Design a protein around this ligand. Structure first.
Ligand SMILES: [Zn+2]
Length: 273
């Protein structure tokens, strides 16, 4: 049942996303056209190729980051936690997301606590438990609210250092497999998480930390499927995923979104209805 999904929520790219300062774009210039193509292809893999029912939300120019829907909602089974993003400028994205999730007839829980913040990017759901990164975007209060929302699942926190989100350097690659970056900080984070759990997780170390962020899915007629970064964007990391012969590997470009800190998981919210 882990990795199973029927629907996926995504959101169109606003032009304001490519109209940001160099300091915010890591010094790189965003090719808005290529970014839209990369998103189109990304959605095409999840929709047409994998058969998921796609819910495409309209772009909002006032919300330059509205494309990264993962941050505004954490879904588990039939319950959806509408988060309170660490960045105030993104708090409004919750409106559209909540509306879509309600339309899907899911149990809605909203994070209103003025003292709580949490980005979905800091949430790693293994299928057995939650690991929540304490970062500049997610605080202890936010983690506690998530734990209170999914009471039947263990929830543990991990410090996020030298990275924006917990998943800036990890994500699930299989039923009991955690893709983890090779950096010193990434390996340390995983060690801390593992120490918290009573379950021994397997791990796949990837040379490029951001390449550790991938999307795993269990499709009925295909089996284990994994969307990962391309050999062109991350040569050193692409070959590592090839070690999963039981997985249907799918290279997905994302060079432009990464310029504004968008990784593979950031652009979609998976739902199993
Ligand atoms: Zn993210």
């Amino acid at each position: 049942t882990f990795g199973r999904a029927t629907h996926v929520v995504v959101r169109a790219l606003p032009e304001s996303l490519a109209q940001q300062a160099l300091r915010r774009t890591k010094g790189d210039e965003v090719d808005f056209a290529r970014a839209e193509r990369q998103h189109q292809l990304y959605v095409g893999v999840l929709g047409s190729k994998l058969g998921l029912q796609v819910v495409q939300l309209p772009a909002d120019e006032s919300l330059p980051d509205c494309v990264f829907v993962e941050d505004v909602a954490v879904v588990c089974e039939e319950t959806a936690l509408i988060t309170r993003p660490g960045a105030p400028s993104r708090r409004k994205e919750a409106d559209m997301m909540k509306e879509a999730l309600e339309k899907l007839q899911l149990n809605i829980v909203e994070m209103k606590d003025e003292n709580a913040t949490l980005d979905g990017g800091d949430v790693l759901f293994t299928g057995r438990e939650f690991f929540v990164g304490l970062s500049k975007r997610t605080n202890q209060r936010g983690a506690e609210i998530l734990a209170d929302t999914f009471k039947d699942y263990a929830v543990s926190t991990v410090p996020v250092v030298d990275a924006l989100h917990l998943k800036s350097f990890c994500s699930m690659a299989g039923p009991n497999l955690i893709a983890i970056g090779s950096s010193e900080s990434a390996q340390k984070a995983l060690k801390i998480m593992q120490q918290m759990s009573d379950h021994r997780y397997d791990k796949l170390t990837v040379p490029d930390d951001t390449a550790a962020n991938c999307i795993y899915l269990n499709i009925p007629s295909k089996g284990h499927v994994l969307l990962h970064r391309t050999p062109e964007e991350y040569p050193e990391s692409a070959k590592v995923y090839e070690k999963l012969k039981d997985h249907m590997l799918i290279p997905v470009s994302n060079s432009e979104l990464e310029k504004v800190d968008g990784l593979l998981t950031c652009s979609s919210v998976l739902i199993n209805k």
